[PDB]
Design a binder for these strands. Structure first.
Lengths: 56, 46, 110
RNA sequence: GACGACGUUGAUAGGCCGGGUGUGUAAGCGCAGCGAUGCGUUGAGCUAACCGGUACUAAUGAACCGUGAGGCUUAACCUU
RNA sequence: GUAACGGGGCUAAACCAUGCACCGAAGCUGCGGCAGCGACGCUUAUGCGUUGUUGGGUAGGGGAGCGUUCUGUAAGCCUGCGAAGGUGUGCUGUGAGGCAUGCUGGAGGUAUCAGAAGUGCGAAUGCUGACAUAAGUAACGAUAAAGCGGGUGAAAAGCCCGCUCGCCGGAAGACCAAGGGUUCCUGUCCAACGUUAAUCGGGGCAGGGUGAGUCGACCCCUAAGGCGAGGCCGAAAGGCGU
RNA sequence: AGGACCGAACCGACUAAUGUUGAAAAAUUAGCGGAUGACUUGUGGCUGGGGGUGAAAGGCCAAUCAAACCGGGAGAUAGCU
RNA sequence: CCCGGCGAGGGGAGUGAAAAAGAACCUGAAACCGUGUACGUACAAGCAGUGGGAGCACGCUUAGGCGUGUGACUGCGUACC
RNA sequence: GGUUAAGCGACUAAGCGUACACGGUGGAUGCCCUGGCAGUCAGAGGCGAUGAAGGACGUGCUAAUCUGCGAUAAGCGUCGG
């Protein structure tokens, strides 16, 4: 239910060895606006594969 | 659950008020002790 | 030349912010900006503002080149914890520790 | 987490078409009846996860990681 | 779980007898060093020429010392050409410790010989404060329920507006007392408070707001009961009561 | 008519589950008992600690009761840790 | 002046002997949490040290074979009160 | 030199450890005293119906608090300094 001895800084960091995050390595880039964004997502301005999907 | 403190200012003043303390020898000694200690609120009057 | 930017007394635990700091350590500022923008995390919002401040300082004070810049050092230090009370069952009281963080970022033209 | 399939040179999922299954003769109209209801249209209508098909929708071009002939010694072979 | 040589393994690496070797302790010896107690040369204002011997240690006894704060020595001495303190380094003593010095620090410190002690902490489920741990784990307080659009804004699942949905409806509605005491309205702000965000709020700041001959209190009257002139009673205090 | 019957409010608390660092220092949910009475409830009042009150359990007397709480005697005493 | 939400919080500038004295302010210890560098560590079992000890890094050195940090492997070794 | 085979074999660090450097947290240490403690020598040893002690509400160019004051309200008169 509770510990008999105080775990160490080492075990703490060892348990956090898998808590690191990952960063998206690449971002989509439209050939219409040239703006980059996540893949399979829409850009801020709204362009998407040269069709001008939602703008407002 | 019904708790112990059921406020009533009338019962408060009649039980611990200034005039209730000044009505007995020992009640007057309470005020003397609180005056000597320097209490800002001698009683529960207001 | 090098520049510095800090955000002290930030409302977040260092442990949470360090997760984001480890993603941009040793990266081009341009590349680090894109990593924080599309990082679905709150600490990323804070770190991005500290980084952005470092960029502006160089361009204003040192008139440096942006593309020629890149991150050099970043670390999150523990800040003052705010003591609060959390009523628990059976009249017992626990103390909440609203931890804070001191965020620091460094850039250079090396 | 993983594992498996697929990503337009495509049936991966949804939708759609058809079928099947289940429920059990929809609604509307008409007829009969004072009426409740019944009959006809009608095994009708609806039908989830199923079956067989279909690019209508979404699965984007890219980018990222991973390199550039792979140690030393000895023996037998190339040169039995 | 082999589990009745510690094991491997051994037909000697077993047992008996004999004998010569070797390993083997902080024992003994050797080399160097410290200290204690003894006798010795009356040595010498005592250290040795030397000399022997001893030196595990709880309770406990005896002996000798380190350092800390304060007083005198001291209107002296050190010190902004950098004190105390803090942090390192080097040297040094048998030890408690000491000396010097780099950095920090930015104004006090103090020899020597004496004197006095709130004089030395790892423990007392010790006291106070700070910080860890479990752990970014449990949990975020009724399973009445949310969805979308627009607006505002740095940012909107939570705020505003609107269309739907859902819940209470002898209440989860409305009006009061008790109690609380500005939580009411407006504007403004989002650090903290709100178990999330927050532009929102019973939050912060400022301003505004409570209008009575008829409501209520006060007032007149009394109930229980309280106080109680005199009075009765009681060591005093005080009690009962007209 | 009824310390009558069924049954809401109201007053209670028989069973079970949950909760047990709880939503709650005794509750929640589903059932349960009484429900014109020895009923229940608001306001105020009286009873004070070896005393009160008690359809009596050593029950209750401000989350404290085989002698309340606060202060004092008080640094009680502790042949024990 | 600049980033930021006419924010918080910072970076400059300036004041000052000092801003590493900036009001969360003299000095700023320790636990505790971090960044960077060197070494070690993913076939090895236990009070985590001690004795021995390679290699690596660094600093010396009139090569002087020493010092500092690390500590593969190895003998012994079950905390304190 | 080439191929094959056998043997040996570094370079990896998700993270961790030790050391050093630079920091954060925290507020010890030292330094400081318009505060306390204990006394000595002097005083005064009472205030109050001429309304006390102690308080409430007020009082400013004043929003709050402290101090002072009391509708003559951080003060009025007079005598001196």
């Amino acid at each position: 239910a509770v510990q008999q001895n105080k775990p160490t800084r080492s075990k703490r960091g060892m348990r956090r060895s898998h808590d690191a995050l990952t960063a998206v390595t690449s971002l989509s880039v439209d050939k219409t606006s040239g703006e980059k964004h996540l893949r399979h997502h829409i850009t801020a301005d709204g362009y998407y594969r040269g069709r001008k999907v939602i703008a407002k | 659950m019904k708790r112990t403190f059921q406020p009533s200012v009338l019962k408060r003043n009649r039980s611990h008020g200034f005039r209730a303390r000044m009505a007995t020898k020992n009640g007057r000694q309470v005020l003397a002790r609180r005056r000597a200690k320097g209490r800002a609120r001698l009683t529960v009057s207001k | 030349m090098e520049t510095i930017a800090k955000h002290r007394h930030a409302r977040s635990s260092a442990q949470k912010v360090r997760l984001v700091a480890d993603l941009i350590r040793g990266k081009k500022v341009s590349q680090a900006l894109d990593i924080l923008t599309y990082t679905n995390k709150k600490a990323a919002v804070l770190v991005k503002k500290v980084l952005e401040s470092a960029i502006a300082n160089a361009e204003h004070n040192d008139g440096a080149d942006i593309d020629d810049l890149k991150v050099t050092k970043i670390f999150v230090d523990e800040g003052p914890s705010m003591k609060r009370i959390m009523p628990r069952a059976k009249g017992r009281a626990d103390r909440i520790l609203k931890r804070t963080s001191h965020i620091t970022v460094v850039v250079s033209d090396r």
